[PDB]
mmCIF file with all atom_site columns, C-alpha atoms and ligand atoms in Angstrom:
data_model
loop_
_atom_site.group_PDB
_atom_site.id
_atom_site.type_symbol
_atom_site.label_atom_id
_atom_site.label_alt_id
_atom_site.label_comp_id
_atom_site.label_asym_id
_atom_site.label_entity_id
_atom_site.label_seq_id
_atom_site.pdbx_PDB_ins_code
_atom_site.Cartn_x
_atom_site.Cartn_y
_atom_site.Cartn_z
_atom_site.occupancy
_atom_site.B_iso_or_equiv
_atom_site.pdbx_formal_charge
_atom_site.auth_seq_id
_atom_site.auth_comp_id
_atom_site.auth_asym_id
_atom_site.auth_atom_id
_atom_site.pdbx_PDB_model_num
ATOM   1  C  CA  . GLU A 1 1  ? 77.219 43.369 30.760 1.00 22.41 ? 1   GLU A CA  1
ATOM   2  C  CA  . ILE A 1 2  ? 75.491 46.750 30.580 1.00 25.38 ? 2   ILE A CA  1
ATOM   3  C  CA  . UNK A 1 3  ? 73.585 45.817 33.778 1.00 26.73 ? 3   UNK A CA  1
ATOM   4  C  CA  . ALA A 1 4  ? 76.845 45.061 35.546 1.00 24.10 ? 4   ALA A CA  1
ATOM   5  C  CA  . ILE A 1 5  ? 78.266 48.357 34.290 1.00 26.24 ? 5   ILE A CA  1
ATOM   6  C  CA  . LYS A 1 6  ? 75.236 50.234 35.623 1.00 23.31 ? 6   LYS A CA  1
ATOM   7  C  CA  . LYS A 1 7  ? 75.898 48.425 38.909 1.00 18.83 ? 7   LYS A CA  1
ATOM   8  C  CA  . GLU A 1 8  ? 79.523 49.578 39.163 1.00 17.60 ? 8   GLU A CA  1
ATOM   9  C  CA  . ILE A 1 9  ? 78.557 53.129 38.169 1.00 17.53 ? 9   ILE A CA  1
ATOM   10 C  CA  . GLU A 1 10 ? 75.924 53.260 40.915 1.00 16.29 ? 10  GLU A CA  1
ATOM   11 C  CA  . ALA A 1 11 ? 78.463 52.178 43.538 1.00 17.62 ? 11  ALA A CA  1
ATOM   12 C  CA  . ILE A 1 12 ? 80.948 54.793 42.308 1.00 19.09 ? 12  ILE A CA  1
ATOM   13 C  CA  . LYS A 1 13 ? 78.320 57.524 42.665 1.00 16.95 ? 13  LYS A CA  1
ATOM   14 C  CA  . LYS A 1 14 ? 77.538 56.351 46.203 1.00 12.45 ? 14  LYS A CA  1
ATOM   15 C  CA  . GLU A 1 15 ? 81.237 56.331 47.117 1.00 10.80 ? 15  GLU A CA  1
ATOM   16 C  CA  . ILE A 1 16 ? 81.800 59.812 45.674 1.00 11.86 ? 16  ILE A CA  1
ATOM   17 C  CA  . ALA A 1 17 ? 78.770 61.089 47.597 1.00 13.22 ? 17  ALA A CA  1
ATOM   18 C  CA  . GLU A 1 18 ? 80.312 59.812 50.835 1.00 16.43 ? 18  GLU A CA  1
ATOM   19 C  CA  . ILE A 1 19 ? 83.647 61.443 49.968 1.00 15.29 ? 19  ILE A CA  1
ATOM   20 C  CA  . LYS A 1 20 ? 81.864 64.778 49.540 1.00 15.61 ? 20  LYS A CA  1
ATOM   21 C  CA  . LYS A 1 21 ? 80.278 64.363 52.980 1.00 12.01 ? 21  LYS A CA  1
ATOM   22 C  CA  . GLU A 1 22 ? 83.683 63.966 54.646 1.00 9.14  ? 22  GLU A CA  1
ATOM   23 C  CA  . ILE A 1 23 ? 85.006 67.041 52.822 1.00 8.42  ? 23  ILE A CA  1
ATOM   24 C  CA  . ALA A 1 24 ? 82.031 69.059 54.091 1.00 8.00  ? 24  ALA A CA  1
ATOM   25 C  CA  . UNK A 1 25 ? 82.740 67.766 57.627 1.00 8.17  ? 25  UNK A CA  1
ATOM   26 C  CA  . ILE A 1 26 ? 86.398 68.733 57.421 1.00 12.97 ? 26  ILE A CA  1
ATOM   27 C  CA  . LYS A 1 27 ? 85.381 72.230 56.309 1.00 13.98 ? 27  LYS A CA  1
ATOM   28 C  CA  . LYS A 1 28 ? 83.351 72.745 59.495 1.00 10.30 ? 28  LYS A CA  1
ATOM   29 C  CA  . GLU B 1 1  ? 83.089 51.245 23.055 1.00 10.51 ? 1   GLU B CA  1
ATOM   30 C  CA  . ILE B 1 2  ? 82.056 49.020 25.958 1.00 7.30  ? 2   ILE B CA  1
ATOM   31 C  CA  . UNK B 1 3  ? 85.795 48.273 26.356 1.00 6.00  ? 3   UNK B CA  1
ATOM   32 C  CA  . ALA B 1 4  ? 86.408 51.995 26.313 1.00 8.26  ? 4   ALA B CA  1
ATOM   33 C  CA  . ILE B 1 5  ? 83.797 52.334 29.050 1.00 7.04  ? 5   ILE B CA  1
ATOM   34 C  CA  . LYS B 1 6  ? 85.466 49.558 31.065 1.00 4.09  ? 6   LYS B CA  1
ATOM   35 C  CA  . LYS B 1 7  ? 88.817 51.355 30.875 1.00 9.97  ? 7   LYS B CA  1
ATOM   36 C  CA  . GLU B 1 8  ? 87.180 54.540 32.176 1.00 7.04  ? 8   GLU B CA  1
ATOM   37 C  CA  . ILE B 1 9  ? 85.580 52.802 35.169 1.00 6.55  ? 9   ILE B CA  1
ATOM   38 C  CA  . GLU B 1 10 ? 88.884 51.198 36.163 1.00 7.95  ? 10  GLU B CA  1
ATOM   39 C  CA  . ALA B 1 11 ? 90.649 54.551 35.848 1.00 8.22  ? 11  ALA B CA  1
ATOM   40 C  CA  . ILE B 1 12 ? 87.901 56.170 37.940 1.00 8.47  ? 12  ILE B CA  1
ATOM   41 C  CA  . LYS B 1 13 ? 88.230 53.532 40.675 1.00 5.48  ? 13  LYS B CA  1
ATOM   42 C  CA  . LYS B 1 14 ? 91.968 54.207 40.964 1.00 6.62  ? 14  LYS B CA  1
ATOM   43 C  CA  . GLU B 1 15 ? 91.512 57.971 41.340 1.00 7.39  ? 15  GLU B CA  1
ATOM   44 C  CA  . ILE B 1 16 ? 88.914 57.452 44.081 1.00 7.16  ? 16  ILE B CA  1
ATOM   45 C  CA  . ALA B 1 17 ? 91.480 55.294 45.884 1.00 8.06  ? 17  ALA B CA  1
ATOM   46 C  CA  . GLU B 1 18 ? 94.061 58.076 45.558 1.00 8.37  ? 18  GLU B CA  1
ATOM   47 C  CA  . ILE B 1 19 ? 91.537 60.672 46.757 1.00 5.91  ? 19  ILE B CA  1
ATOM   48 C  CA  . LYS B 1 20 ? 90.895 58.655 49.925 1.00 5.62  ? 20  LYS B CA  1
ATOM   49 C  CA  . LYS B 1 21 ? 94.636 58.418 50.595 1.00 7.53  ? 21  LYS B CA  1
ATOM   50 C  CA  . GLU B 1 22 ? 95.046 62.162 50.033 1.00 6.35  ? 22  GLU B CA  1
ATOM   51 C  CA  . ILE B 1 23 ? 92.212 62.906 52.472 1.00 5.48  ? 23  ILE B CA  1
ATOM   52 C  CA  . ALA B 1 24 ? 93.864 60.602 55.020 1.00 4.50  ? 24  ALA B CA  1
ATOM   53 C  CA  . UNK B 1 25 ? 97.170 62.477 54.540 1.00 6.15  ? 25  UNK B CA  1
ATOM   54 C  CA  . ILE B 1 26 ? 95.581 65.832 55.257 1.00 2.00  ? 26  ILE B CA  1
ATOM   55 C  CA  . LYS B 1 27 ? 93.926 64.511 58.414 1.00 2.00  ? 27  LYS B CA  1
ATOM   56 C  CA  . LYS B 1 28 ? 97.299 63.358 59.776 1.00 2.00  ? 28  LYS B CA  1
ATOM   57 C  CA  . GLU C 1 1  ? 71.647 53.087 27.069 1.00 2.00  ? 1   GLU C CA  1
ATOM   58 C  CA  . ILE C 1 2  ? 75.273 53.641 26.063 1.00 2.00  ? 2   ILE C CA  1
ATOM   59 C  CA  . UNK C 1 3  ? 74.583 57.380 25.503 1.00 2.00  ? 3   UNK C CA  1
ATOM   60 C  CA  . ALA C 1 4  ? 73.338 57.622 29.068 1.00 2.00  ? 4   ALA C CA  1
ATOM   61 C  CA  . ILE C 1 5  ? 76.300 55.653 30.423 1.00 2.00  ? 5   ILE C CA  1
ATOM   62 C  CA  . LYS C 1 6  ? 78.821 57.957 28.742 1.00 2.00  ? 6   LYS C CA  1
ATOM   63 C  CA  . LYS C 1 7  ? 76.887 60.957 30.070 1.00 2.00  ? 7   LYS C CA  1
ATOM   64 C  CA  . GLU C 1 8  ? 77.158 59.628 33.630 1.00 2.00  ? 8   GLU C CA  1
ATOM   65 C  CA  . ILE C 1 9  ? 80.849 58.761 33.259 1.00 2.40  ? 9   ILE C CA  1
ATOM   66 C  CA  . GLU C 1 10 ? 81.596 62.214 31.833 1.00 3.35  ? 10  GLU C CA  1
ATOM   67 C  CA  . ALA C 1 11 ? 79.795 63.761 34.810 1.00 2.18  ? 11  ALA C CA  1
ATOM   68 C  CA  . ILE C 1 12 ? 81.667 61.534 37.274 1.00 2.00  ? 12  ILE C CA  1
ATOM   69 C  CA  . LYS C 1 13 ? 85.023 62.554 35.776 1.00 2.00  ? 13  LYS C CA  1
ATOM   70 C  CA  . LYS C 1 14 ? 84.088 66.217 36.133 1.00 2.00  ? 14  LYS C CA  1
ATOM   71 C  CA  . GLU C 1 15 ? 83.097 65.622 39.758 1.00 2.00  ? 15  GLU C CA  1
ATOM   72 C  CA  . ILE C 1 16 ? 86.392 63.879 40.565 1.00 2.00  ? 16  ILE C CA  1
ATOM   73 C  CA  . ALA C 1 17 ? 88.410 66.719 39.024 1.00 2.00  ? 17  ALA C CA  1
ATOM   74 C  CA  . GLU C 1 18 ? 86.494 69.229 41.152 1.00 2.00  ? 18  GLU C CA  1
ATOM   75 C  CA  . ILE C 1 19 ? 87.178 67.133 44.260 1.00 2.00  ? 19  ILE C CA  1
ATOM   76 C  CA  . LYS C 1 20 ? 90.929 66.998 43.578 1.00 2.00  ? 20  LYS C CA  1
ATOM   77 C  CA  . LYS C 1 21 ? 91.101 70.780 43.143 1.00 2.00  ? 21  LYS C CA  1
ATOM   78 C  CA  . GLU C 1 22 ? 88.996 71.468 46.250 1.00 2.00  ? 22  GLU C CA  1
ATOM   79 C  CA  . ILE C 1 23 ? 90.948 68.994 48.397 1.00 2.00  ? 23  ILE C CA  1
ATOM   80 C  CA  . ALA C 1 24 ? 94.177 70.856 47.595 1.00 2.00  ? 24  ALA C CA  1
ATOM   81 C  CA  . UNK C 1 25 ? 92.529 74.140 48.720 1.00 2.00  ? 25  UNK C CA  1
ATOM   82 C  CA  . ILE C 1 26 ? 91.648 72.784 52.143 1.00 2.00  ? 26  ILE C CA  1
ATOM   83 C  CA  . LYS C 1 27 ? 94.006 73.630 55.010 1.00 2.00  ? 27  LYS C CA  1
ATOM   84 C  CA  . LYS C 1 28 ? 93.501 71.366 58.033 1.00 2.00  ? 28  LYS C CA  1
HETATM 85 CU CU1 . CU  D 2 .  ? 95.001 63.355 44.624 1.00 2.00  ? 101 CU  D CU1 1
#
């Protein structure tokens, strides 16, 4: 279960990283 | 403990969904 | 392992709160 939790956490970090890229794009 | 962690991940997923909708609202 | 998972979740929460504040600051 811990492995599956580490899997969901890794996808959340990747999705947040993409959200930060769009915010940086909107700023420009 | 692990249940507590599960409730945090589900709450995090819902905020990320709301953040995407808020970004879409600002673009419009 | 659990100590590291809580540390990542606590950091993700802090990142989401920063994103919500910064998104409100943006003017299209
Ligand atoms: Cu919001």
